[PDB]
Design an enzyme around this catalytic site. Sequence first.
Site, PDB file in Angstrom:
ATOM      1  N   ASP A  24      -0.050   4.732  -8.714  1.00 43.81           N
ATOM      2  CA  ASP A  24      -0.247   3.437  -8.052  1.00 43.81           C
ATOM      3  C   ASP A  24      -1.288   2.575  -8.774  1.00 43.81           C
ATOM      4  O   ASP A  24      -2.458   2.605  -8.396  1.00 43.81           O
ATOM      5  CB  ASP A  24      -0.724   3.735  -6.617  1.00 43.81           C
ATOM      6  CG  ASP A  24      -0.472   2.591  -5.630  1.00 43.81           C
ATOM      7  OD1 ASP A  24      -0.616   1.409  -5.996  1.00 43.81           O
ATOM      8  OD2 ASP A  24      -0.126   2.877  -4.462  1.00 43.81           O
ATOM      9  N   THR A  25      -0.891   1.783  -9.777  1.00 46.84           N
ATOM     10  CA  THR A  25      -1.892   1.056 -10.627  1.00 46.84           C
ATOM     11  C   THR A  25      -2.677  -0.089  -9.949  1.00 46.84           C
ATOM     12  O   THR A  25      -3.595  -0.651 -10.550  1.00 46.84           O
ATOM     13  CB  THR A  25      -1.280   0.491 -11.924  1.00 46.84           C
ATOM     14  OG1 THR A  25      -0.093  -0.244 -11.623  1.00 46.84           O
ATOM     15  CG2 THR A  25      -0.953   1.587 -12.867  1.00 46.84           C
ATOM     16  N   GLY A  26      -2.312  -0.440  -8.717  1.00 49.91           N
ATOM     17  CA  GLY A  26      -3.056  -1.433  -7.930  1.00 49.91           C
ATOM     18  C   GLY A  26      -4.206  -0.837  -7.146  1.00 49.91           C
ATOM     19  O   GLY A  26      -5.210  -1.524  -6.884  1.00 49.91           O
TER      20      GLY A  26
HETATM   21  C1  LIG Z   1       2.976  -4.616  -2.419  1.00 49.19           C
HETATM   22  C2  LIG Z   1       3.763  -3.907  -1.302  1.00 49.19           C
HETATM   23  C3  LIG Z   1       5.236  -4.304  -1.386  1.00 49.19           C
HETATM   24  C4  LIG Z   1       3.565  -2.396  -1.197  1.00 49.19           C
HETATM   25  N1  LIG Z   1       4.346  -1.796  -0.078  1.00 49.19           N
HETATM   26  C5  LIG Z   1       5.643  -1.106  -0.292  1.00 49.19           C
HETATM   27  O1  LIG Z   1       6.335  -1.250  -1.519  1.00 49.19           O
HETATM   28  C6  LIG Z   1       6.305  -0.422   0.933  1.00 49.19           C
HETATM   29  C7  LIG Z   1       6.244   1.113   0.988  1.00 49.19           C
HETATM   30  N2  LIG Z   1       7.753  -0.781   0.984  1.00 49.19           N
HETATM   31  C8  LIG Z   1       8.190  -2.162   1.287  1.00 49.19           C
HETATM   32  O2  LIG Z   1       7.294  -3.233   1.555  1.00 49.19           O
HETATM   33  O3  LIG Z   1       9.601  -2.396   1.375  1.00 49.19           O
HETATM   34  C9  LIG Z   1      10.101  -3.379   2.304  1.00 49.19           C
HETATM   35  C10 LIG Z   1      10.026  -3.082   3.823  1.00 49.19           C
HETATM   36  C11 LIG Z   1       8.941  -2.146   4.390  1.00 49.19           C
HETATM   37  C12 LIG Z   1       9.343  -1.079   5.403  1.00 49.19           C
HETATM   38  C13 LIG Z   1      10.821  -0.915   5.802  1.00 49.19           C
HETATM   39  C14 LIG Z   1      11.827  -1.986   5.346  1.00 49.19           C
HETATM   40  C15 LIG Z   1      11.270  -3.257   4.700  1.00 49.19           C
HETATM   41  C16 LIG Z   1       2.145  -1.895  -0.966  1.00 49.19           C
HETATM   42  O4  LIG Z   1       1.468  -2.001   0.277  1.00 49.19           O
HETATM   43  N3  LIG Z   1       1.479  -1.295  -2.145  1.00 49.19           N
HETATM   44  C17 LIG Z   1       0.304  -0.370  -2.108  1.00 49.19           C
HETATM   45  C18 LIG Z   1       0.665   1.114  -1.967  1.00 49.19           C
HETATM   46  C19 LIG Z   1       1.342   1.570  -0.677  1.00 49.19           C
HETATM   47  C20 LIG Z   1       2.852   1.803  -0.659  1.00 49.19           C
HETATM   48  C21 LIG Z   1       3.436   2.623   0.494  1.00 49.19           C
HETATM   49  C22 LIG Z   1       2.739   2.591   1.848  1.00 49.19           C
HETATM   50  C23 LIG Z   1       1.211   2.482   1.822  1.00 49.19           C
HETATM   51  C24 LIG Z   1       0.534   1.859   0.593  1.00 49.19           C
HETATM   52  C25 LIG Z   1      -0.482  -0.519  -3.425  1.00 49.19           C
HETATM   53  O5  LIG Z   1       0.403  -0.229  -4.522  1.00 49.19           O
HETATM   54  C26 LIG Z   1      -1.039  -1.933  -3.690  1.00 49.19           C
HETATM   55  O6  LIG Z   1      -1.796  -1.856  -4.917  1.00 49.19           O
HETATM   56  C27 LIG Z   1      -2.009  -2.470  -2.614  1.00 49.19           C
HETATM   57  C28 LIG Z   1      -2.216  -3.977  -2.868  1.00 49.19           C
HETATM   58  C29 LIG Z   1      -3.681  -4.378  -3.064  1.00 49.19           C
HETATM   59  C30 LIG Z   1      -4.389  -4.025  -4.393  1.00 49.19           C
HETATM   60  C31 LIG Z   1      -5.926  -4.105  -4.489  1.00 49.19           C
HETATM   61  C32 LIG Z   1      -6.638  -4.948  -3.435  1.00 49.19           C
HETATM   62  C33 LIG Z   1      -6.019  -4.994  -2.033  1.00 49.19           C
HETATM   63  C34 LIG Z   1      -4.520  -4.715  -1.835  1.00 49.19           C
HETATM   64  N4  LIG Z   1      -3.284  -1.723  -2.800  1.00 49.19           N
HETATM   65  C35 LIG Z   1      -3.957  -0.917  -1.756  1.00 49.19           C
HETATM   66  O7  LIG Z   1      -3.444  -0.788  -0.429  1.00 49.19           O
HETATM   67  C36 LIG Z   1      -5.185  -0.161  -2.291  1.00 49.19           C
HETATM   68  N5  LIG Z   1      -6.448  -0.893  -1.935  1.00 49.19           N
HETATM   69  C37 LIG Z   1      -7.453  -1.148  -3.014  1.00 49.19           C
HETATM   70  O8  LIG Z   1      -7.130  -1.092  -4.400  1.00 49.19           O
HETATM   71  C38 LIG Z   1      -8.907  -1.396  -2.630  1.00 49.19           C
HETATM   72  C39 LIG Z   1      -9.642  -0.060  -2.491  1.00 49.19           C
HETATM   73  N6  LIG Z   1      -9.092  -2.190  -1.385  1.00 49.19           N
HETATM   74  C40 LIG Z   1      -9.194  -3.677  -1.384  1.00 49.19           C
HETATM   75  O9  LIG Z   1      -9.519  -4.430  -2.565  1.00 49.19           O
HETATM   76  O10 LIG Z   1      -8.896  -4.361  -0.134  1.00 49.19           O
HETATM   77  C41 LIG Z   1      -9.698  -5.483   0.269  1.00 49.19           C
HETATM   78  C42 LIG Z   1      -8.861  -6.370   1.174  1.00 49.19           C
HETATM   79  C43 LIG Z   1      -8.329  -5.763   2.476  1.00 49.19           C
HETATM   80  C44 LIG Z   1      -8.037  -6.686   3.669  1.00 49.19           C
HETATM   81  C45 LIG Z   1      -7.892  -8.191   3.444  1.00 49.19           C
HETATM   82  C46 LIG Z   1      -8.626  -8.799   2.248  1.00 49.19           C
HETATM   83  C47 LIG Z   1      -9.154  -7.880   1.129  1.00 49.19           C
HETATM   84  C48 LIG Z   1      -5.229   1.384  -2.162  1.00 49.19           C
HETATM   85  C49 LIG Z   1      -6.640   1.983  -1.970  1.00 49.19           C
HETATM   86  C50 LIG Z   1      -4.118   2.026  -1.291  1.00 49.19           C
END
Ligand SMILES: CC(C)[C@H](NC(=O)[C@H](C)NC(=O)OCc1ccccc1)C(=O)N[C@@H](Cc1ccccc1)[C@@H](O)[C@H](O)[C@H](Cc1ccccc1)NC(=O)[C@@H](NC(=O)[C@H](C)NC(=O)OCc1ccccc1)C(C)C
Lengths: 99, 99
Positions: free
Chosen positions: B25-27
């Site tokens: 997961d590169t994000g």
């Molecule tokens: C971009 C989305 C489409 C993606 N979701 C999916 O592809 C899902 C499974 N599928 C999908 O959406 O398909 C369509 C749908 C869904 C369900 C059923 C039918 C229809 C996603 O949430 N991607 C994340 C992984 C994931 C996938 C499966 C389920 C659970 C989590 C990371 O790759 C992606 O990199 C996110 C985006 C991002 C990057 C960096 C900054 C904030 C958010 N990072 C994260 O969730 C990560 N957080 C971080 O890198 C840091 C630690 N926190 C941060 O900077 O957050 C501050 C922030 C939070 C609140 C608001 C403002 C700031 C990580 C620790 C898990």
Amino acid sequence: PQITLWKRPLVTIKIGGQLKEALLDTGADDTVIEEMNLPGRWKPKMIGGIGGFIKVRQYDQIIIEIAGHKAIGTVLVGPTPVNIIGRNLLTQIGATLNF
Amino acid sequence: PQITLWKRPLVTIKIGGQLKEALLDTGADDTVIEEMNLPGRWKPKMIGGIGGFIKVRQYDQIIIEIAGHKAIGTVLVGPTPVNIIGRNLLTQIGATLNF
Ligand SMILES: CC(C)[C@H](NC(=O)[C@H](C)NC(=O)OCc1ccccc1)C(=O)N[C@@H](Cc1ccccc1)[C@@H](O)[C@H](O)[C@H](Cc1ccccc1)NC(=O)[C@@H](NC(=O)[C@H](C)NC(=O)OCc1ccccc1)C(C)C
Ligand SMILES: Cc1ccc(S(=O)(=O)NC(=O)NC2CCN(c3nccc(C(F)(F)F)n3)CC2)cc1
């Protein structure tokens, strides 16, 4: 390119005359951005996150330059905390993980 | 190897002497893993992403094998809907985005 992961993989993206940055995201099914003055109307969608689910605004046949390369696809607009380029657009520009 | 991205990049891992599968997961800045006890002491932490925030037990110096490549690092334990090997551990196994 061959990007190392000691910092966030933020690249220059361009879209309909808007320069921006974005996150190349191998764990993101879809491409998701915070705003842009896109093709008017939008079929709604729900996407999956770590902390629950959000409502987004789907726009298709979207031309987008990413890091040089041209790409065509489905840019969602939603309450994302950073511009994310997911596998749907990463495929077309030949982007691969390697180790 | 060279992982194309037409599908989710899930790989075999070995952690707490327990075999799993987990999404590269590169994000993700951190590494997040579903419930399990690990050894040593943890400290509270909240992380956030799409949907909002969750809570985690942060563990340190946690030895972990990833597609058969050894790695020591910080590993977060909390209720993710998917196991995520984020950037902290990707840098160890030498992962790069290539296009
Ligand atoms: C971009 C989305 C489409 C993606 N979701 C999916 O592809 C899902 C499974 N599928 C999908 O959406 O398909 C369509 C749908 C869904 C369900 C059923 C039918 C229809 C996603 O949430 N991607 C994340 C992984 C994931 C996938 C499966 C389920 C659970 C989590 C990371 O790759 C992606 O990199 C996110 C985006 C991002 C990057 C960096 C900054 C904030 C958010 N990072 C994260 O969730 C990560 N957080 C971080 O890198 C840091 C630690 N926190 C941060 O900077 O957050 C501050 C922030 C939070 C609140 C608001 C403002 C700031 C990580 C620790 C898990
Ligand atoms: C075709 C080709 C093969 C090899 C290479 S490389 O020079 O051996 N590796 C490399 O350069 N790594 C980093 C530096 C450049 N960079 C990046 N690359 C493309 C686009 C963007 C931008 F601006 F939009 F964000 N940034 C980050 C990775 C280059 C080309």
